[PDB]
Design a protein around this ligand. Structure first.
Ligand code: HEM
Ligand code: HEM
Ligand code: HEM
Ligand code: HEM
Ligand code: HEM
Lengths: 305, 306, 305, 306, 306, 305
């Protein structure tokens, strides 16, 4: 069974578009979802082969129910507020996601255009982000970001619903959250200190030896081992965004996993603490201003509506 | 020549346009930054060569010029002329400084813009910030190829660079910016044949319409203007689309360099006020100017030294 | 069971070479077919991985009988002439086909040279066509060409012979037609009208909605659904060619499928019509001057002689 | 003042060569087209920047020149002088106009060719049309590297461009074209050692053979000429392979620009007729000229002015 | 599956080969390194995607295996067998560990090598270090195309990866390495026709010589072997040239992966000792082996878990 | 008049440095080679255009110049001036010829070097041979961006090329080479903040430190010189890392072209001996010069004769 373009090459542009369905607009959305497959290609085909245009369409809990005839993804729920001693992970409205990516921005902008064209009226926009990669895979804190993602079969294994919920095998669970960074603060740190916050070296992107790496460091609190005894894995594609004018500097978080337990556990760790840690040090510089969750169906699923 | 700023740039695929005003007090901080701008271009740009083609061109407004330097003014430098037409209005908005930042990747623009606005925290107020992108086959937001008739080589040198006529500032140029917003609902209502009648070229093949077919109210008609000699009077453009899908904003950011503004301003008069032949440029029936500023972009020597 | 390079990546250049077998060349041809796989590699290897050289070799009905004995592919027959009210699809000679593709012309030409080198004397050339990608995947009518072709495993299952004819699993059925356009006339239509002939938008390459799309449009007559409701798909890699000297502007058509009943259906609809369409409007501007049907065997069938 | 045609184009990987005659009374339609050729280059080319590298060079024959303009003639311009050698014959074939169209993709050449011959349908007759491509690693059909010793940069400017010596037409050049067909069966019969003896360089490493050993009937031998000026006489070539495998046709399309034909013509004399110490260029024993034409390729502004 | 190491690698243009021995009581420090090597691949490589193509393949010798792990041994693992032939000798040199580092640029190889040997300072002794580079058209030091007949896709899967036959170590492979030096003076003494007789393919066009005419002492002859399975017996090679013009050293570094060494070893027997119808592989008359070592390159999961 | 050698060369990522001495009686063989070197550049380079970017610059030592030619000597040409400083010593090593060979790929350098040393077997003795490689983001072995503030375009012409001041040799330049070895263990001991204090720029963003904060014993400090008139005195560098992991050798090969050596020499005086401000350039505390040689690289015409 065939999934949407979750596993993409590195792509260096993206548009993240989040919307909510006015009541009334649920037949208009059924319609767009059937066609969304074919608009990917309308825009993408003439740009082969550099384009690498891909759209991942995800649906939120509330919206699922309004929209669909029968039974529900196992894992799907509203995103869960995390009300921690110090940091708060908020929970924002979000019925639909379009995760648009390609090797150039206009390709994304063309597809977003053609989509909202068919929705004008039936939805209301919540959030829109125009993302770009730094020329050597850095995020807004200046660290290489993407290094430890899974590949090949590991990724096919850690992202796609399989036999555990087999009416939607080929689906995935996306979490999104927009973060805004306190760059004045962050850049006030020594590099040595910043490594302590992330858990890897700034310039060479090597992992800090197991005994020099703080446990409040991001890489510590997100390395998390199952019942299974094996490592538990998500797939990210965090895109910097922002505005120099509005002093806005951001990293847009997106995290695919085969179940939301995995993503959600990493987030408890980050916002609430462990045995040995108050909260994730990175959040002392990064404020979450969105949060939603979505299921991103198989592609077979959408074509048939 | 004196060595000029990177006005003659290749096709680049992304740009940031940053327009600011100088607060009271900020005079000093700005002079410091202008001396260093050259060198920030290189810091940020050098490690990504030659895939990169980062260029920053810095220009200065009329009012701002007087606050910053004493001595001679460039001959042509003035506030942008507001044009109150029968139908369409070309408006004048404030801007003391302009940064036209261009490269093949957006992040290179943004890294440079960060370093610049970083060093001007305190000293300015941002008026306009636009992130633009070329559509994949050099087309603009109306779906026509955009930049075809621009000059190159030495003809460009002749059209944009101040020379002997104001020798103090040889190597400089006069940049005019206007941010336009388009009414696409309306535009996509026309047949292609009609749209070509607005622009004056063929949509798909980008060939000029023949002299006997091309309407007098077409864009290409009203912006071809002939000199004293009857030789065509030319500018350099690098119009970039921008916008936002959520808030139905589809735009073309206009930018135009010339050796003297009398040229650029002529084209505007014809566009907004009309000739005997044409009421106004049909393109304005789909495009609304919401900014307007005039700037002088000095030779890079002039910044390197103070 | 391993197949010939029918599913090739998007390539920008191609040679189409069609020949007939002289009497007493049968030997020399079998020798060549055993080696063709290996000449692909000789020539192609040194220009990897930009190269994307692929050669697909197919065989006509009458030629098959002269070369082998025993069981024949179920579907293999001479191309069916179509004598329609208006438009006629012709049948031309063709014992062998070489569909050679790459990213550079020289690679195609070097391969074609080494093949015709080994067959100089055994065959007679009937048709030789050098094609090229126009801009951004547009054909000679100026529309985007390839867009609704199947990809990935949908293509696997629509072009490759399987269980239904198990002796020849891994094979395919290519149909070729050389078409010429009366551009004269086509450039006489407004774009609105031209879209009405094709069934998609010229510039944005989006489908016309079913409420406006004429039933005499190309996209109309070439969408066919089966008894079981699912789409019947083929794979095309139409290549423009021509000569400006002789005002010859063409699109060379090629169509692979797991059975010709599919390709042939689409042709019947194009040339002869439905209830609600006289014939495909595209033929009012396009003239078929060849027609040939070939079977492209699994690669192990050729290696093993 | 004067800007020349894109003769000094980079190495490009595809070309169309189109040669035509002017029909009776077609002179008008052609002048119209020559004024616009520059503009069609840009229409077609601009949207495919910067990969495209589309260039068209337009040249004009001797007899055609008189039909189209009088006024001054370029000093050197004459019909191609037929060379009836002891063994090998360099023939003269008809040709009033030449379009040497080059880019990185064939479709760009063909799209320009379409637009040109579109405007000339009726007024001309095509004599020769050739689609040429790069073979691997700048090799020709005989499998040797082809273009190595071409002059570059400003040395090219000096060798190809008409200057002060004929100042009316400064910026022009003299293109000679010949279409050659090869006898591959015969050529691939030679050992590589022997083939190198024909050409005068090493096949694989493309190094010159030493004075010690290079035959004087080798191609590189016969085409090295020193002037009275003691300096080497240099031309610029962009030899392009073409062919069809069906009709056993393997070719090199030859084209040679120089500031004067006396130069190109000399090399030909040596190739076809021989020296004191060599019968004819060994290359001709495998290559047959089936066309031959001479043209003048004016400065680009000269065509603008019609 | 299990995940195997990066044995089936794309075309890469550069490589570092590192062979070391483990000192007294280095066993601990090495196990530490092996657990992390996968992740240093990614540290160094990830930020240079997708041009980089950086891959590191890590192998272990027979004696070294026993020091580091007990548990099962891989079926095939043994010290490299010296072959003391009639004429030519294949030597055995020491090697406990192997790093076969490949990418598109050398500096990426070197950066990875640095980070590895950084973590082993103290605990090993370098035996062999080689910086290799492909010629631009996949040629080796003898001037022939090298890699052509290597298997691809799942036929490579089938040839190289330990499978069911020893399921403990499925995903592993057997690398044999040998460093060769050439006497190029001697080699460049042959005509090309003769050189093709040594190799068994055409120099220029890289086509196999016909079964009629290919010598049985040619390299391609002696290294095509058929099994019991009727099937051809295949390995995977990634020969890289290296050398130094100062020290008149020109080399081909050989490396050969297979699912069992019985395969690789057979080819060597035929090369060095001869068959019924060949004294030795003609290629050895121009190539001298100066190293020789055998390694097992485990499944990648086997390293992660230490 | 003059066309110069390929000194103003594009950014290239690979290089061979070859330094040799002329044996007794080899004067003949060398003159022959120098006449031909121009044309070996093109033999080897032409078939790889335009990716290849192969260039060779050939320079000649002071002692050697006298052996080879009679007539004028370049005004500036002399043996390298040894500098025995308080702490660090810049040494003089032997060198009659230099080949500074550069391309995008190393095989191209090596193929050309083969052809050169092929034609000199017997007539020279190799002193130094170095294979260099630029790291992916224009960084050197210390991990800083290297090349940033080099002059370009016309400013380079003005700073590197002999002109009217010695018009016999206009089109020439003066190359100085030094091979440096680093103590990396020591260097990677420093915090990044400290390392920036050695260099005078920011490691990660490669921005100059402001005039107030920049140490006057920093590298960038001691190598900014202004002339008598107060216009900045510039050279052109193309520092290339090299090394060997086995033999713990990690290096930067230095090369510096200028229109007169008295410029390059000045920078060195400041580096090795000090100003009042500075004991010596902090970079030498981590970098040891183990070669040193000076060469004149003629106009290219001069070799054609
Ligand atoms: C401002 C937000 C964030 C930034 C700037 C950020 C940055 C980073 C960086 C620099 C790394 C190290 C390189 C790498 O392996 O990617 C990393 C690793 C990681 N991050 Fe984040 N991150 C952010 C938010 C999150 C969130 C919300 C999650 C999960 C809910 C997450 C999950 C991970 C995981 C699983 C790893 C790798 C664990 C391993 O190394 O085995 N990150 N992040
Ligand atoms: C003669 C010149 C032809 C031209 C220029 C041409 C061009 C096109 C174009 C532009 C499209 C729409 C873009 C796309 O869907 O790929 C199209 C669609 C298609 N064409 Fe053709 N075509 C030609 C002949 C044929 C023939 C002979 C066949 C079949 C026997 C065929 C089969 C198809 C199919 C199956 C589709 C897609 C159906 C869908 O939208 O679900 N074409 N053609
Ligand atoms: C079939 C026709 C031709 C072929 C295949 C051919 C091919 C070649 C080849 C392989 C070379 C050696 C590499 C190079 O230096 O470019 C060469 C050199 C040259 N060819 Fe030709 N050529 C042909 C015709 C001509 C003609 C007709 C001329 C002049 C009328 C010409 C003029 C030259 C010149 C001047 C050189 C180089 C001299 C120097 O070494 O300094 N070629 N040609
Ligand atoms: C000494 C330097 C060596 C060089 C320079 C070299 C070079 C070549 C070349 C040029 C080819 C032909 C192209 C191809 O198919 O790759 C080839 C084929 C091959 N080489 Fe080598 N080789 C060397 C050593 C070895 C060794 C030691 C082995 C095995 C022990 C080996 C095994 C093979 C195999 C199996 C083939 C292809 C067989 C087939 O045609 O089906 N080579 N080698
Ligand atoms: C010892 C190894 C050397 C290394 C690793 C090295 C590295 C660097 C680095 C990273 C920079 C900053 C980026 C740049 O502008 O290029 C720099 C600047 C510079 N270096 Fe070096 N360098 C070395 C030796 C030398 C030597 C020996 C000289 C001169 C005799 C020299 C002359 C310069 C000059 C002139 C500048 C620029 C002045 C200005 O900033 O306006 N370097 N070097």
């Amino acid at each position: 069974p065939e999934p949407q373009m979750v596993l993409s090459p590195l792509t260096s542009a993206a548009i993240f578009l989040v919307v909510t369905i006015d009541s009334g607009g649920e037949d208009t959305v059924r319609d767009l979802l059937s066609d969304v497959a074919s608009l990917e290609r309308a825009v993408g085909f003439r740009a082969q082969p550099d384009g690498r245009l891909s759209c991942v369409t995800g649906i939120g809990s509330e919206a699922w129910d309004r929209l669909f005839s029968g039974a529900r993804p196992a894992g799907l729920h509203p995103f869960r507020e995390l009300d921690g001693p110090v940091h708060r992970a908020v929970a924002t409205p979000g019925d639909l996601l379009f995760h648009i990516r390609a090797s150039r921005l206009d390709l994304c902008f063309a597809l977003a255009t053609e989509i909202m064209g068919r929705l004008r009226g039936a939805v209301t926009p919540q959030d829109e982000v125009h993302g770009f990669k730094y020329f050597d895979e850095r995020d807004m804190l200046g660290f290489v970001d993407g290094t430890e993602n899974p590949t090949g079969a590991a990724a096919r294994r850690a992202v796609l619903v399989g036999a555990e919920d087999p009416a939607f095998a080929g689906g995935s669970y996306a979490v999104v959250q927009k973060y805004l960074h306190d760059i004045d603060a962050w850049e006030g740190l020594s590099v040595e200190a910043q490594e302590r916050v992330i858990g890897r070296r700034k310039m060479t992107d090597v992992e800090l030896s197991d005994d020099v790496k703080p446990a409040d460091s991001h890489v510590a609190l997100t390395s998390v081992t199952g019942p299974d005894g094996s490592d538990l894995e998500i797939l990210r594609d965090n895109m910097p965004f922002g505005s120099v004018g509005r002093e806005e500097f951001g990293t847009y978080f997106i995290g695919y996993a085969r179940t939301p337990e995995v993503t959600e556990t990493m987030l408890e760790r980050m916002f609430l603490g462990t045995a040995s840690a108050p909260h994730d040090r990175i959040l002392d510089f990064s404020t979450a201003v969105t949060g939603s969750l979505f299921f991103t169906p198989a592609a077979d699923f959408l074509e048939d509506l």
